[model samples]
Target chain A: MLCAISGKVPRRPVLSPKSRTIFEKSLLEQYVKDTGNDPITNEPLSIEEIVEIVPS
Target chain B: HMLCAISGKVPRRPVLSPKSRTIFEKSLLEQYVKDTGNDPITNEPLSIEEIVEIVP
Candidate 1:
């Protein structure tokens, strides 16, 4: 799957359920810390909400 | 605040683009992404897989 922010495949993929966006782990974490928002939805997001996920 | 990027209407099948952090109608975004490979609002690189089909 393509990463929502970086537009590249994620080596460590994660999901923000509140925003329904998937992202690369580090990219998303930094964004959440800096912006406190989901990258796509701009909805309020906390770092704890985004969880690493595995889909085979 | 969330509206289709192209049509500016509510989406029956909503998808969010991380590049611009904008919502879009799925059908509209699908064709646009295929044709231009870019988000209409941000003009960032977009892929079908990058589209986040959101939930209620």
Candidate 2:
């Protein structure tokens, strides 16, 4: 698997609410800080909107 | 289980990368940021600062 942002494997995974896109935690913080929009769909986004994916 | 877009495994510590909003493992994200400067899914330029941690 690969990170949507870094294109590399992630040690922790999270999901975007609107687009359900996967991202690395650190990358998400940086992008959210830079632009409060979904990188894939360009929709409005927030850190609270993301969901943590726990292993099942 | 939600799979890490990068590692293809359930992440222990999940995080959301900004922009792409992709789910990734925290440590993997750090490694990716160190190795590359872009999102894996979108290949867009990224910084480690844009990521956010999700509490599960």
Candidate 3:
């Protein structure tokens, strides 16, 4: 899972080729479930937002 | 009379009156605030202590 652990969400499922265009591939899209928008910023986050630092 | 409304970012009204103590009101309010909440909603900070409670 190349996109397994960074915090940026892929616009499409990670394995699909389109995922590379929308996201910077080097960053880990942390494996978390998208909850909802940020309460303060009101920014909508995909499931990737809840990431804690994990060792690769 | 409302200072918050003046700010235009008036928080979701702290659903219970600060004086109210019914568990029903308090529990739901606590859950709502915890799930969708963060500090600095506009110029005010929601106190963490306020959400601490005695469950029965």
lDDT of each: 0.75, 0.72, 0.29
lDDT tens digits, residue span A11-45, model 2: 67667666656678778767777899878788888
Q: Please give, for residues A1-56, the per-residue lDDT of candidate 3 as tens digits.
A: 11233434333212211121122222323311233433223455454433221111
As a TM-score, model 3 comes out at 0.19
Best by TM-score: 1
Candidate 2 clashes: the total is 44
Better of 1 and 2 by TM-score: 1
Ranking by DockQ: 1, 2, 3
C-alpha lDDT (0 to 100) for residue A42 of candidate 1: 84
Instruction: Give the CAPRI rating of model 1.
Output: incorrect
Candidate 3 RMSD to the correct structure: 17.4
lDDT of 2: 0.72
Q: In candidate 3, residue B51 scores what lDDT?
A: 37
Report the C-alpha displacement of residue B44, candidate 1, in angstroms.
1.7
> How many angstroms is residue A22 displaced in model 1 relative to the true structure, after the best TM-score fit?
13
User: Can you write out model 3's per-residue Cα lDDT over B26-53, one digit (the tens) per residue?
Assistant: 4445554566553223323344454323
On the 0 to 100 scale, the lDDT of residue A16 in model 3 is 12
